[PDB]
Amino acid sequence: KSPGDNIDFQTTILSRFDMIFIVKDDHNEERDISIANHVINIHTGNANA
Amino acid sequence: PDAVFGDRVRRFQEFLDTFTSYRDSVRSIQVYNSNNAANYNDDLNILPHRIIISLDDLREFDRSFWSGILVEPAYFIPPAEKALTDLADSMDDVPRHPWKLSFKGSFGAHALSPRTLTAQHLNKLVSVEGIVTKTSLVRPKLIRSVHYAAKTGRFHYRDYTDATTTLTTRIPTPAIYPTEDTEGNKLTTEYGYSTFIDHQRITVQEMPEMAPAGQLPRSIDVILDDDLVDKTKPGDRVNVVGVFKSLGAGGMNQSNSTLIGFKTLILGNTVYPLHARSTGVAARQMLTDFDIRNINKLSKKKDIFDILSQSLAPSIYGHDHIKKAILLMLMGGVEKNLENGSHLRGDINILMVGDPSTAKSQLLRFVLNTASLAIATTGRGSSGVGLTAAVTTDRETGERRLEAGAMVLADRGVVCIDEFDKMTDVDRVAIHEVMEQQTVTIAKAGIHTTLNARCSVIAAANPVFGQYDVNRDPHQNIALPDSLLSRFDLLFVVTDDINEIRDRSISEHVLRTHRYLPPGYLEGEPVRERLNLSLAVGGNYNGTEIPKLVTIPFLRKYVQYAKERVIPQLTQEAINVIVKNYTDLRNDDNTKKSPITARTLETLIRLATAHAKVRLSKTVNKVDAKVAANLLRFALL
Ligand SMILES: Nc1ncnc2c1ncn2[C@@H]1O[C@H](COP(=O)(O)OP(=O)(O)O)[C@@H](O)[C@H]1O
Ligand SMILES: [Mg+2]
Q1: Is B325 annotated as a binding-site member?
Q2: Nearest by CB to B357, which of A10, A11, A15?
Q3: Where does motif Arginine finger map (chain A)?
């Protein structure tokens, strides 16, 4: 689908913004292992230190 | 008699003898009254007996007396008023109401707000800026009553005073209304010989532009006397100069026993209706003789239409025909009032539809900034009662009153509508009457009245598909009823067509536009925003007094002089051109964005008349008709 086909509004608001960011789910093991470890260190307290 | 009172009277005599501007202002008021009285005697208006006093000149003359007026006005203002009255009576012997005073200038710490006013400013002369929310009915107040005794055939009188009419508190002596003389005879009230002074109460609230965004607003009460009534309407931004005074006893007597506190209000001395953006006060600028000569020097040039148009928004590249249309809208045509009561429009209405990010909103904001009485509205934000009128209930009288919407408040002005295509249907039906009959007819439960809504409407709209398609016909592109298009005199379709050299011109213009500093500003210093309030009386940056491009402040004066002075009339050489082009446009085979109805014909007339205001010509010539015709043709083709 087009980027204006996924928005639930007109395409003029997209031109109205200064910087748009299309944020992805990369859907692979090498990234979500790192994300899972980051969140576990957040919950543990290592990331605070 | 008081010695310090006489000393201050003499000091104000010296101050008035030093500055002769107040003296010949008194002279000009008295001779105006005398010539009006003489014209009434032989074959009208009477100027009030008050003089505007500059506080800066008084500070330059006497610091002590200036600080006395600012800090202790009850001890210093009445000597100054008596001095002005004596000066007026000194020169009035050759050709009775005592003269009042008003103040302008810098007030320092006394330039306050309804929120900022506290009890430390009591018994002091304050200048409070704000917005008028409530305006009481102008009520006459009896000062002296005159009575007749028929048995003895004699006229008596009694004077009445209150704590409001005086700055210095005296003993309250309540003299009852005499219905019987000292001998016991009945008195008849002689209305017409008694004197009544107009009294008004207004409520000044802090401006919503300078108020905290979530808190409840603070308000003050201002009392106005005869010459100062009816100078304000609700919704105006105002500057009130007056003495902040407390009255009565705050429950400290036995009869009162409550915590209203001491009642606090302002005895108004000066009322200045300030012009603010998207408000009901029209901006007025004083036209000096030099500026009039400059305007007449512009009017003689052949290129005059293309300098005033190109000098509108030099920071917007292109859109030159839209600049011409906006200038002609600012001129505003001539309104015809026929002898049988039928009415013909003079105002020019502009609609712009087209691609996003094409200087539509910026042009609307420019018209909001540069017009005298422009009011900004958006599509969904204001409704059918929001633009036209609504009904509310009075607290005092108990009867319903009216509240004026955007069209009524912007009478003899401009309504700047953004997102025109997002109006509701009932709002559109409200717009239909305003754009042609120039009036708002409201028939509510018990209220039936017509309000004057003589407005020029400039509107920005978007196509229904978000972008204009060249191959598709404009009927589905604009997708607006043909009555609405017939209301609009000029419809402009702005297309964001992509060309390399055009895009380079856009980039160079914008990048040179983003490299500006105001004079007196450093390279890295950020620009400060000051709110624009102007007193209402009655890509080249270096534009200073018509080098090549006209300044916006001088454009305003040119527009004001043209609207006030010249009322052009048609002649046959323009009529022939207008008739021929209207006949050609009605019977042309070319497809056009807007349908050609009868309105277009008057559009031509108005446009031609508008160009005659640009040249300051009492006559509408052939060249005016031709420039109206080819401005219409570009918008249509
Ligand atoms: N012809 C032009 N010249 C200079 N600037 C322009 C032009 N067209 C658009 N812009 C810029 O694009 C921005 C978008 O605002 P605007 O075009 O008014 O939005 P819209 O067209 O949706 O009303 C503005 O800040 C303005 O500076
Ligand atoms: Mg816009």
Answers
A1: no
A2: A15
A3: 15-18
Technique behind the model: cryo-EM
Using CA atoms, how far apart are residues B161 and B175, in angstroms rounded to an integer? 9
Atom of ligand 1 nearest to the CA of B509: 4
Q: In Å, how far is A9's CA from the nearest CA of chain B? A: 11
Give the resolution value in Å. Answer: 2.9
* Terminal alpha carbon distance of chain B: 83
The residue with tokens 């005592």 is B98
10 Å Cβ neighbour count for B403?
Answer: 13
User: Residue of the nearest CA to atom 6 in ligand 1?
Assistant: B359
Q: How far apart are the first and last CA of chain A?
A: 44
- Taking CA atoms only, the protein residue closest to ligand 1 atom 19 is B357
Q: Which residues contact B421 (CB under 8 A, 6 or more apart)?
A: B353, B379, B461, B462, B464, B479, B480
Determine what percent of chain A falls in helix, strand and coil, rounding each to the nearest 5: 50, 0, 50
For residue B354, which atom of ligand 1 is closest to its CA?
21
* Helix, strand, coil fractions of chain B, as percent rounded to 5: 35, 25, 40
B356 is in an annotated binding site: yes
A9, closest residue in chain B (CA to CA): B466
Q: Which residues of chain B does A16 touch, with a Cβ-Cβ cutoff of 8 Å?
A: 356-357
Residue of chain A with shortest Cα separation from B467: A12
**Cross-chain residue pair B466–A16, CB shorter than 8 Å:** no
Classify B254 as helix, strand or coil. coil
**B79 CB-near residues (< 8 Å, 6+ apart):** B5, B6, B8, B9, B11, B12
Interacting residues of B595 by C-beta distance below 8 A, sequence separation 6+: B482, B485, B486
Task: Give the Cα separation of B272 and B537 in Å (integer).
Answer: 9
Question: Which of helix, strand or coil describes residue B577?
Answer: helix
Within a 13 Å sphere around the CA of B93, how many CA atoms are in the beta-carbon half?
A: 4
Q: What are phi and psi of B359, to 5 degrees?
A: 60, 30
Say yes or no for a CB contact (<8 Å) between B462 and A12: yes
Query: In sequence order, which residues have a C-beta less than 8 Å from that of residue B423 and are 6 or more positions away?
Result: B379, B380, B431
Tell me, using a 6 A CB cutoff, whether residue B462 lines ligand 1.
no
Look at A10 and B466 and tell me if their CB atoms are within 8 Å: yes
Alpha helices, H only, B438-499: 474-478, 482-487
> Which residues, 6 or more positions from B263, have their beta carbon under 8 angstroms from its beta carbon?
B246, B247, B248, B250
Nearest C-alpha neighbor of B10 from the set B77, B59, B98, B82? B82
**Dist. CA A44–CA A39, nearest whole Å:** 9
Q: How many angstroms separate the CA atoms of B86 and B565, rounded?
A: 39
Q: Tell me the C-alpha distance between B522 and B451, whole Å.
A: 51
Chain A residue with Cα closest to B355? A12
